[PDB]
Amino acid sequence: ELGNANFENFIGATEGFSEIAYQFTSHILTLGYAVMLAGLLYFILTIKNVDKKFQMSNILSAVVMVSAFLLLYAQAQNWTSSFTFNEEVGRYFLDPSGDLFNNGYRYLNWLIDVPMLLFQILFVVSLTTSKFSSVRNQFWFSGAMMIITGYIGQFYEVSNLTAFLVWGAISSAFFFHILWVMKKVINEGKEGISPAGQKILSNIWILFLISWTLYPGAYLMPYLTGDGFLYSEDGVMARQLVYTIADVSSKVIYGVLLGNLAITLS
Amino acid sequence: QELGNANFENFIGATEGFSEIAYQFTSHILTLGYAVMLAGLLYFILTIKNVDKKFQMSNILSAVVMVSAFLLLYAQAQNWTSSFTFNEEVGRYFLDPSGDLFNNGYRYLNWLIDVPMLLFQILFVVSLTTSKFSSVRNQFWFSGAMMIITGYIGQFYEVSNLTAFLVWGAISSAFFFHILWVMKKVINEGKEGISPAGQKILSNIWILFLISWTLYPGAYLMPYLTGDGFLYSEDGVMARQLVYTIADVSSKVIYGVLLGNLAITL
Amino acid sequence: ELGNANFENFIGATEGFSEIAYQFTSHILTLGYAVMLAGLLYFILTIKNKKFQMSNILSAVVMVSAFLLLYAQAQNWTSSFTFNEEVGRYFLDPSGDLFNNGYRYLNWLIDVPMLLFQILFVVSLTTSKFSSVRNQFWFSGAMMIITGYIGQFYEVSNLTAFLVWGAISSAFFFHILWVMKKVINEGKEGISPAGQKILSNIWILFLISWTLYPGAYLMPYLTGDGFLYSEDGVMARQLVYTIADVSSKVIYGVLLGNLAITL
Amino acid sequence: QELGNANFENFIGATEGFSEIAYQFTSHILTLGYAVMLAGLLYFILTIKNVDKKFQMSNILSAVVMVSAFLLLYAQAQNWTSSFTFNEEVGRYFLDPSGDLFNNGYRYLNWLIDVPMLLFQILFVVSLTTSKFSSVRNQFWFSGAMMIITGYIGQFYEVSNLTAFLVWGAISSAFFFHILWVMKKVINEGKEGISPAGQKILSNIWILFLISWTLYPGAYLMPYLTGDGFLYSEDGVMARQLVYTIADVSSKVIYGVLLGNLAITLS
Amino acid sequence: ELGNANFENFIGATEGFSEIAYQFTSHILTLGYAVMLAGLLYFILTIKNVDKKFQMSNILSAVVMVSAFLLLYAQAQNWTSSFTFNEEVGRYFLDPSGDLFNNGYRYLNWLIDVPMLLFQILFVVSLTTSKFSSVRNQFWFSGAMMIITGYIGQFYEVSNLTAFLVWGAISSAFFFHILWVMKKVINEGKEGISPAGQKILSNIWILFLISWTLYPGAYLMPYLTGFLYSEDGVMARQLVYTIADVSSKVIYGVLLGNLAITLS
Ligand code: NA
Ligand code: NA
Numbered sequence A: 001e002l003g004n005a006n007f008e009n010f011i012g013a014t015e016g017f018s019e020i021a022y023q024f025t026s027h028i029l030t031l032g033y034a035v036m037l038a039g040l041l042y043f044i045l046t047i048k049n050v051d052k053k054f055q056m057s058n059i060l061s062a063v064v065m066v067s068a069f070l071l072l073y074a075q076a077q078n079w080t081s082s083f084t085f086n087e088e089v090g091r092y093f094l095d096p097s098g099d100l101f102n103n104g105y106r107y108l109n110w111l112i113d114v115p116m117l118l119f120q121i122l123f124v125v126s127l128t129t130s131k132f133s134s135v136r137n138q139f140w141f142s143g144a145m146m147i148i149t150g151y152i153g154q155f156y157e158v159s160n161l162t163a164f165l166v167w168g169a170i171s172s173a174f175f176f177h178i179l180w181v182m183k184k185v186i187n188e189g190k191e192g193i194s195p196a197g198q199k200i201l202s203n204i205w206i207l208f209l210i211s212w213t214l215y216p217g218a219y220l221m222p223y224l225t226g227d228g229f230l231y232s233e234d235g236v237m238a239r240q241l242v243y244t245i246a247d248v249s250s251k252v253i254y255g256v257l258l259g260n261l262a263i264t265l266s
Numbered sequence B: 001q002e003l004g005n006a007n008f009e010n011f012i013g014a015t016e017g018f019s020e021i022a023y024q025f026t027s028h029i030l031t032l033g034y035a036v037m038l039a040g041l042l043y044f045i046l047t048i049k050n051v052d053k054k055f056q057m058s059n060i061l062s063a064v065v066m067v068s069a070f071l072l073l074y075a076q077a078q079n080w081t082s083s084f085t086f087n088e089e090v091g092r093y094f095l096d097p098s099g100d101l102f103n104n105g106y107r108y109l110n111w112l113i114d115v116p117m118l119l120f121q122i123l124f125v126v127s128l129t130t131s132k133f134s135s136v137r138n139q140f141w142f143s144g145a146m147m148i149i150t151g152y153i154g155q156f157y158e159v160s161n162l163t164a165f166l167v168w169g170a171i172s173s174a175f176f177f178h179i180l181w182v183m184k185k186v187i188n189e190g191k192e193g194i195s196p197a198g199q200k201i202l203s204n205i206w207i208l209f210l211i212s213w214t215l216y217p218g219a220y221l222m223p224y225l226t227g228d229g230f231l232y233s234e235d236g237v238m239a240r241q242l243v244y245t246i247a248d249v250s251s252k253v254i255y256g257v258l259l260g261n262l263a264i265t266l
Numbered sequence C: 001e002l003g004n005a006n007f008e009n010f011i012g013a014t015e016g017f018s019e020i021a022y023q024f025t026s027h028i029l030t031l032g033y034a035v036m037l038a039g040l041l042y043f044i045l046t047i048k049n050k051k052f053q054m055s056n057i058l059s060a061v062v063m064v065s066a067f068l069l070l071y072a073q074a075q076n077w078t079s080s081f082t083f084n085e086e087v088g089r090y091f092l093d094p095s096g097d098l099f100n101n102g103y104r105y106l107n108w109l110i111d112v113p114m115l116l117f118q119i120l121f122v123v124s125l126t127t128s129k130f131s132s133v134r135n136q137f138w139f140s141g142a143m144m145i146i147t148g149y150i151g152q153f154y155e156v157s158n159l160t161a162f163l164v165w166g167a168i169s170s171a172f173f174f175h176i177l178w179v180m181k182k183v184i185n186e187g188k189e190g191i192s193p194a195g196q197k198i199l200s201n202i203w204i205l206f207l208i209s210w211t212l213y214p215g216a217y218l219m220p221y222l223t224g225d226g227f228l229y230s231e232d233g234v235m236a237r238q239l240v241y242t243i244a245d246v247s248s249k250v251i252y253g254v255l256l257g258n259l260a261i262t263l
Numbered sequence D: 001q002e003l004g005n006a007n008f009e010n011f012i013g014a015t016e017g018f019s020e021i022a023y024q025f026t027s028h029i030l031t032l033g034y035a036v037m038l039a040g041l042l043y044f045i046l047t048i049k050n051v052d053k054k055f056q057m058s059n060i061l062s063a064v065v066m067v068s069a070f071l072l073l074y075a076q077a078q079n080w081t082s083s084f085t086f087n088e089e090v091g092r093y094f095l096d097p098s099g100d101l102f103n104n105g106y107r108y109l110n111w112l113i114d115v116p117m118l119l120f121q122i123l124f125v126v127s128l129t130t131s132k133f134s135s136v137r138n139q140f141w142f143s144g145a146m147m148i149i150t151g152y153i154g155q156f157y158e159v160s161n162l163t164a165f166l167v168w169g170a171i172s173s174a175f176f177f178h179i180l181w182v183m184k185k186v187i188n189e190g191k192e193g194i195s196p197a198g199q200k201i202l203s204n205i206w207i208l209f210l211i212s213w214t215l216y217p218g219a220y221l222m223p224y225l226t227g228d229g230f231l232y233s234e235d236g237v238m239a240r241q242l243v244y245t246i247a248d249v250s251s252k253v254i255y256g257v258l259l260g261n262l263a264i265t266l267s
Numbered sequence E: 001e002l003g004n005a006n007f008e009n010f011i012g013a014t015e016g017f018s019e020i021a022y023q024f025t026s027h028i029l030t031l032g033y034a035v036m037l038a039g040l041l042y043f044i045l046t047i048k049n050v051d052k053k054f055q056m057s058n059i060l061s062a063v064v065m066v067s068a069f070l071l072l073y074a075q076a077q078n079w080t081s082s083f084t085f086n087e088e089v090g091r092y093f094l095d096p097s098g099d100l101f102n103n104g105y106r107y108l109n110w111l112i113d114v115p116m117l118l119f120q121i122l123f124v125v126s127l128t129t130s131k132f133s134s135v136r137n138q139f140w141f142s143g144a145m146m147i148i149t150g151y152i153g154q155f156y157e158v159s160n161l162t163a164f165l166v167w168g169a170i171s172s173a174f175f176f177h178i179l180w181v182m183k184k185v186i187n188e189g190k191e192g193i194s195p196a197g198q199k200i201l202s203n204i205w206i207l208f209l210i211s212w213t214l215y216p217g218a219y220l221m222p223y224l225t226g227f228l229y230s231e232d233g234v235m236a237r238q239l240v241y242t243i244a245d246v247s248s249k250v251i252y253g254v255l256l257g258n259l260a261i262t263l264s
């Protein structure tokens, strides 16, 4: 009787996880937060490589790295806590005492970092037509709502597909509205800056586009092959891999690029 | 079980128990809480040279509060996760005696340090007119401590004895009004003799300070805010913990930022 | 069969601690080490605000140790007493080791010398000799702690040795108080009325705060089986120890930073 | 003994168990490992200004490496101590299922970060002649990632499936010799133009880079380096973890130290 | 059946540790790693109190602090976790599930710090007839051997008195060599510096000499009275170790930071 719990638990409570499935998910989750802390050191140490007016970028990246590190750390410990090795069957099964696994830790992280990552770009690029304050608010309203909704939905990823997908959809709505506004910003930013700067913003968009799309992919990860192929421990491994890749990208790499764009203008 | 003078969370967790969502959300939000604090710290440290030397005590005090909050909020979080365990038979989280009872005391005492720091740091940005610096500082510190110490007491009796609960709570409320009376008196005098940019910020700092500080007494009473009503359940717990976290973030981080920003405009 | 252990354990192994008693003591102890780390940040950031800066450094050195040890204490408290669902009280849990204020005490081995030796980097002595005033502070400082450290193991198993070492320790205490007075005075010489007013406030603080420790030492026996030979005695002791440590190290170091400004 | 695709440490730990020396050493050597990482981190962060502004990216990258290695090598050590417990009856450390199985995985995924960094950093200290910056970088990265990933997979079969083990191992090696080649090509193109001091360092760096990195494969096969012979036991585990440590200290710390000197002698 | 372990375990697995014996060891071990983190701060916040050419010493002192901190911390957690209170007899006995206790953590700590400590002095003083490098390699080769040889032996400090002494002896030989070299390093160090600086170098030599001697004293502790093969011997050993480590790294480092100031 799990209830509204993540499908990792249902997998752990029945089939269990193999050494490879458990270990990899464990390592990939550790790598996640180890990367975040490394990223922090990088942003701080490179604060003096850019002018004074672009530094609020590096700062926000650093703030995000911290936030991320703590929650990705909690998340990794949640994984290892919630699944124990069964010596008589050689598999890792749900361990009631260590609490049920939940990705909500990561989600609420987003609630902090999304608004940060979308806002910090406004400190490097200048807006031609659109208004700083307005673009920000939209980013923040859509950003928050996008997570709050998705956060709510993922609870029902097994106990209720309908609610799962409805919320997932309402979330998706706001998602595109961010993409829209971002593309808008990227352009107005390319207006009046060295080709080098322009090239960097372009690569930032590709990165922002791919990475941010991976998230909803992981949100559905379990069903992307209808009790198919990804409704198993393979689906769990995949989901966490994507998540970790997504974070490293949409945070660290994203921030690095913005740091270079800040130097190109500096 | 026999709990005695314990917080209302423990009685819910010792009877109904907590549903996955209720327990997980509370666990998450409490984690977000202390994550934000350490992040905010990084911000306040790195934005120190963004303001004159005379205003840098503000940022410094903000950074101090951050560390303060991080440690205690961290403790308050681990107090949650360890005081409630999953029951595989009914799939709900129930009071785990060995992990110590849950108490919001860690947080309350977090304030005992910070309430003074927050009321004090604004005095390193603004300048008064008819009020003595120390005179204000003292009234803050006295009313600040008395407010918390009296509330800290009462919240031990929120379940075991409502009359004491409300009495101590009320006595605390008195000191609460006094601190508002004074802080409003301080933002007026502070607004006198400054620019238009600062004038606007402090007006924002006020409403913020107002809404966020009112939340606390709201959370204090949470359970009893709908008469065995609707909030005398796990929902009441979720609400409370959410409210605290939002507030704590606002009262120290947003608040800290607004002040730190106001120091820049100078 | 406890043996030479703090009276927290005897209370915990018999009456047990009530929610309020165990929680408050647990909270106050947490606050304790929280304040230390917070302070660490303060003293590292205010270093600017050059000859005096060794003061801020030493304060920071105290903060670090304080945090690490006061933290250990808190965890020692929480892991040594467990809630009993049947009677609803926190009783001694052996597996988590017996409680002991020994962590605090050894913290003092470090902090006491530093706190004393640091004021010498702000004020300027008249006729007294820097290195001499230092050695006294250190020899006495160390002895005061080592002796009291020994005595507190007997605060229950042997009321005599407890008081003997206690008394001995108290000798070094008064000594230190004497020297520190000789420093406050010689410091007041040749500085604005502000610089003085500060050192005066430092004296009162240092006097009151440092007297709280020996009060805590006897806290159990400050009302004769009295009112303070119970959980309330444990609360009190730990409240006092935290109040002192915050005053003697943080507020203290802050006042030395302010005097370091007027100068 | 139904372990599955697990490292040979568990197979020893669940059968013969580890003696005091064997378990303790491994435990110590692992801890020293992540201690050196945090020690070195400080060194790089404090020597940032001892080199001109264009070379500093090296110092900074080394610092980043140090942090990751710290955490993951920490996790690794905690993995070892949690996965084996003393048995009073026979005084030997045996596998403790509750504390999860042991797996060097933590260290491997460490490399995912650190291998690209260590390779990409030297390109901030030296100047190239024929081959271009980006081209060298991407071959380092692509190859680096593949090498680690194919090795990471293979080590899961170091017992359950000897073939798949050696197969991937070899596949990894391919990407390895590729990295060696492209590196010596960089060391050389680097020596060109710089003082006999910098040139002297690069020489030293190469020696290091070659040895240190060769040690990894050595660890990979540690158990099978003496056939069921002598290294299929607790000693084999000791030897492996010792090597992994020596190798990680050399490949990242000593290495980054040398790239620091080089950055100095090029100011 | 413990096998090749430190006598701490044999005492804890037989006699048991009294509240005091256990609590003190626990405290002193904590104090140890606490001092290390405090020292770190000091050496960081005082880097700028000396000329650039000397600063390397401060940094190396800080490095050592970090290393020491962690490993001492581990050592502390190893002590506390390895021995549990027995409420029925009122003493602390070996808890198998917490791993056996071992000083090995500390020894491997030295495997780093020793090199750094002998090395860092070369960034303050100036030799006269010996080369910077030669002296550094003599230190390092010997410093390593001394630690490894001793690390081995301490595993047999009960199971095998012979191997214990044999390795300890072999280790000592390298110890003397380091005293010889370090002696030559201080004499040449005094050449060409104010008598004030000379005096600090003298103190340093005594500190170095005394504190570094303590270690083999601890190594043997148990057998230093054929009332020391008890819990008292354990207390003694751990106190000495801590005193030594504080002295040989912190105080040592401070005195060098002062010699850097005088020479600035
Ligand atoms: Na697990
Ligand atoms: Na729990």
Ligand code: NA
Pocket: B098, B099, B100, C077, C078, C079, C080, C081, C082, C083
């Ligand atoms: Na407890």
Ligand code: NA
Pocket: D080, D081, D082, D083, D084, D085, D086, E099
């Ligand atoms: Na173990």
Ligand code: NA
Pocket: C095, C096, C097, E080, E081, E082, E083, E084, E085
């Ligand atoms: Na114990």
